[PDB]
Amino acid sequence: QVQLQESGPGLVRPSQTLSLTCTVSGFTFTDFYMNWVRQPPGRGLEWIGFIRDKAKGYTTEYNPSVKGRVTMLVDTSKNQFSLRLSSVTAADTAVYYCAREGHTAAPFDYWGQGSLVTVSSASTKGPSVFPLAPAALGCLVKDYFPEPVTVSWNSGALTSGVHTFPAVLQSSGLYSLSSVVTVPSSSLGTQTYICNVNHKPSNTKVDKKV
Amino acid sequence: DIQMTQSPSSLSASVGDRVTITCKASQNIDKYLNWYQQKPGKAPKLLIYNTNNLQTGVPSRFSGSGSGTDFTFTISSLQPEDIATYYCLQHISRPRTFGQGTKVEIKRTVAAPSVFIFPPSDEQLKSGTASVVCLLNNFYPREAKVQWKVDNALQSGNSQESVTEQDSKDSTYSLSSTLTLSKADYEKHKVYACEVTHQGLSSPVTKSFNRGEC
C-alpha cells in the first residue's frame, strides 16, 4: 500500500548531530501528522514529538524531554520528513521510528522499518562473511561495527528454514552474528545459495556463496 | 507526562489459553488508549485504537475493554504467532506515553535439540584467526548448555551464546555457539567436538569431528 522507509548515519560521534530522513510514498503530509518514535536497546518507545499538516501550518510540538534539541520539518517536494538532534550522547541511542499519525487510527498507524543510530566515539568496520559449509547451511558475518547488519539468502526465495541470529560483541569490541538456514537433505546439487549480507553503517556489500 | 504502566511485564501463557494484559494509568485517559503488538525485531504495529476499537487486518481474538484508568487487553486464545511484546499507550495529553511493555513467551512441549557442528572456513583460517561454530536448532525450553571439547580436552574462554527469539510457527528457540579458537591452534589439535545436554533429551549428545585433514 504505503511506504515509510527511514535513513541516516548509523553511528554518530558524541557532540556531533543526529540526522535522519523518513522518505514517504503513498500519502501526503497535507492530510497527516508525521511524528517520530525512538526506542533504546531493549527498552520502550518514547515519543519525541510530531509535526502538523498543511492546515495547521507545518508546526511542530516536541515531547518535553528532547525539546530544545530536536527539530523536525518537511520538504513536501521530496516527500521526506527529516529529524535533527543536536548533542547526541550515548543516551539518545535506539531505533528511531517515523510513525504517521493517521485518521482516528491515530496515533501511529503506519510505522517505518527501523534505523539504528549508535552514539559512540568509535568508528565503522566492514564485516567479513565466511562461507560456512554443512542438513544445514550458514554464513559467518564476522567482525564489524556499528550495527545492525542485515542478511537474506537468494535475495528472496529462501525463507522458512532460516535462523539469522542476533549479535555478540567480541572482545575485539566487534560484533559478530552468523545466519544459518537448514535445507532439505537431498537438494544441494551443483546448485546456488547466495549469501546476501548487507551492512549500511559501513557502505559494504557481500554476497558469499555458501 | 501521565505515566502509563502495564502488567504483567514478561508473562508465559499457552496456546489456546487467554492472555489478559492490563494497564492502569497515573491520571485519567478516557477512550484515548490504543494498543500495539511489536513482533520480535520489528517495529510497533497498531492492534487497537481508542480503548476498544479494532484495526483492519488485526484478528478478532484480540480486543479492548472499558476506559477510565484501569485498562485491559485480552486474547480469546493465543497462537504461536503471538510471541510479541505488547504495548499500551494514551494520547489525551502530551507528551504521549507507553507502558513499560509486556513480553509474552509461548509455552509448548519439549522439542529435544538438533546439532550441526560446522568445521572452520578454509579461508577464515587465513587470518591467523579461526572460529569453529556450533549450532543446535529448534528446541525447548531455552535451557541448553553446550560443552566444547578440543582433543577430548578444552581451554574454555572461547565459547559464546546467542540464541534466537521464539519461532512463531514452532515456538522453539535456537542458539549457535561459536568456538573461536583462532588460527595456529585449529591445527595444533584435531577433534574439537561440541557435546550438548538439554532438559528434554536425556543422556547428552554431540556432533563432533577429528577434523579430517592436514
Write the DSSP string, A51-91.
E--STT-S-EEE-TTTTTS------TTTT---EEEES--TT
CA distance B3 to chain A (A): 12
Q: Do B96 and A140 touch (CB under 8 A)?
A: no
* Distance in angstroms (rounded) separating the CA atoms of residues A36 and A57: 18
Burial B138-165 (b: 16+ CB within 10 A, else e): bbbeeebebebebeeeeeeebebebbbe
Alpha-carbon Rg for chain B, nearest whole angstrom, is: 23
Contacts of B124 (CB under 8 A, 6+ apart): A128, A130, A140, A142, B130, B131
Beta strands of B2-71 (E only): which ranges? Answer: 4-7, 10-11, 19-25, 33-37, 45-49, 53-54, 62-65
Alpha-carbon distance of B112 to B149, in angstroms, equals 21
Q: Specify the CATH number for A122-210; select among 1.10.540.10, 3.10.580.10, 3.65.10.10, 2.60.40.10.
A: 2.60.40.10
Hunting for cell 529448534 — which residue is that?
B138
How many contacts does A have with B, using Cβ atoms within 8 A?
A: 114
Give dist(CA A208, CA A138) in Å, integer: 10
* Nearest in space to B197 (alpha carbons), one of B151, B149, B147: B147
Residue B82 falls in which region: left (phi positive, over 0), alpha (psi -120 to 50) or beta: alpha
Q: How far is A63 from chain B (nearest CA, A)?
A: 5
Tell me the domain boundaries of chain B: 1-108, 109-211
- One DSSP character per residue, A156-173 reads SS--SS-B-----B-TTS
Residue A118 CA to residue A91 CA, distance in Å, equals 9
For residue A9, give the C-alpha cell: 548515519
Nearest to A138 among B43, B87, B118 (CB): B118
**Which residue, among B31, B4, B6, has the nearest Cα to B20 in the 3D structure?**
B6
Secondary structure of residue A31 in the 3-state scheme: helix
What CA dihedral angle connects A68, A70, A75 and A81, to 10 degrees? Answer: -150
The structure was resolved experimentally with X-ray
Q: Residue A85, exposed/middle/buried by CB under 10 A (0-12, 13-18, 19+)?
A: buried
Of B95, B99, B175, the CB nearest to A47: B95
C-alpha to C-alpha distance for A45 and A37, rounded to whole angstroms: 6
Grid cell listed for A156? 528472496
Q: Which residues of chain B are within 8 Å of residue A104 when distances are taken between CB atoms?
A: 49-50, 53
| Residue B137 contacts A, CB cutoff 8 Å | yes
Specify whether the CB–CB gap between A24 and A3 falls below 8 A.
Answer: yes
Closest among A29, A12, A142 to A81, alpha carbons compared: A29
What dihedral angle (degrees, nearest 10) is formed by the CA atoms of A108, A113, A117, A122? 170
Q: Work out the burial of residue A169: count CB atoms within 10 Å of its CB; fewer than 13 is exposed, 13-18 middle, 19 or more buried.
A: exposed
| 3 state SS of B209 | coil
Phi, psi of A131 (to 5 degrees): -55, 100
Query: Rounded to a whole number, what is the largest CA-CA distance in chain A?
Result: 63
Look at residue A30 and give its three-state secondary structure: helix
CATH H-level, domain B109-211: superfamily: Immunoglobulins (2.60.40.10)
Residue A200 C-alpha cell reads as 549500511
The whole-angstrom separation of Cα B131 and Cα A156 is 28
A179/A150 Cα distance (integer angstroms): 9
Residues of B with CB below 8 A from A138's CB? 118, 133, 135, 176
**Contact B209/A at CB under 8 A:** no
**CA of A120 vs chain B CAs: smallest distance (Å):** 22
- Residue B150 and residue B182 in contact, taking contact as beta carbons nearer than 8 Å: no
Residue B96 near chain A (CB below 8 Å): yes
Q: Where are the beta strands (DSSP E) in chain A?
A: 3-5, 11-12, 17-20, 23-25, 33-39, 46-51, 60-62, 83-86, 94-101, 116-119, 128-132, 138-144, 150-153, 175-177, 194-199, 204-209
Residue with cell 496515533: A107
Contacts of A199 (CB under 8 A, 6+ apart): A126, A127, A141, A144, A149, A150, A205
A1-121 and A122-210 in the same fold:
yes
C-alpha A111 chain-centroid distance? 12
Distance from CA of B124 to the nearest CA of A (A): 6
Domain boundaries defined on chain A: 1-121, 122-210
Q: Is the peptide bond before B141 cis (omega within 30 degrees of 0)?
A: yes
CATH classification number, B1-108, choose in 2.60.40.1290, 2.60.40.10, 3.40.50.970, 3.40.50.720: 2.60.40.10
Q: Please report, for residues A27, A44, B41, B96, B139, the alpha-carbon distance to residue B49 in angstroms, rounded to integers and kept in the order given.
A: 21, 19, 23, 14, 36
Question: Residues of A with CB below 8 A from B34's CB?
Answer: 107-108
Query: Could you tell me the end-to-end alpha-carbon distance of chain A, in angstroms, rounded to an integer?
Result: 35
Whole-number CA gyration radius for chain A? 20
- Contact (Cβ atoms closer than 8 angstroms) between residue A107 and residue B91: yes
Given an 8 Å threshold on Cβ–Cβ distance, is B178 in contact with A177? no
User: From start to end of chain B, where are the E strands?
Assistant: 4-7, 10-11, 19-25, 33-37, 45-49, 53-54, 62-65, 72-75, 85-90, 97-98, 102-104, 144-149, 161-163, 175-177, 193-198, 205-206
Grid cell, residue A82, equals 527529516
The answer to whether the beta carbons of residues B7 and B25 sit under 8 Å apart is no
Q: Is the dihedral of CA A134, A136, A137, A140 positive or negative?
A: negative
Q: What is the rounded distance in angstroms from the CA atom of residue A99 to the CA atom of residue A50?
A: 9
Q: Return the residue of B nearest to A138 by Cα.
A: B118
CATH superfamily label, A1-121: Immunoglobulins (2.60.40.10)
Dist. CA B57–CA A2, nearest whole Å: 15
A42/chain B closest Cα distance in angstroms? 10
State the greatest distance between any 2 C-alpha atoms of chain B, in Å, as a whole number: 73
Q: Which amino acid is at B86?
A: Y
Question: A17-20 and B85-90: which strand pairing?
Answer: unpaired
- Cell matching residue B30: 478516557
Nearest CA in chain B to A148: B41
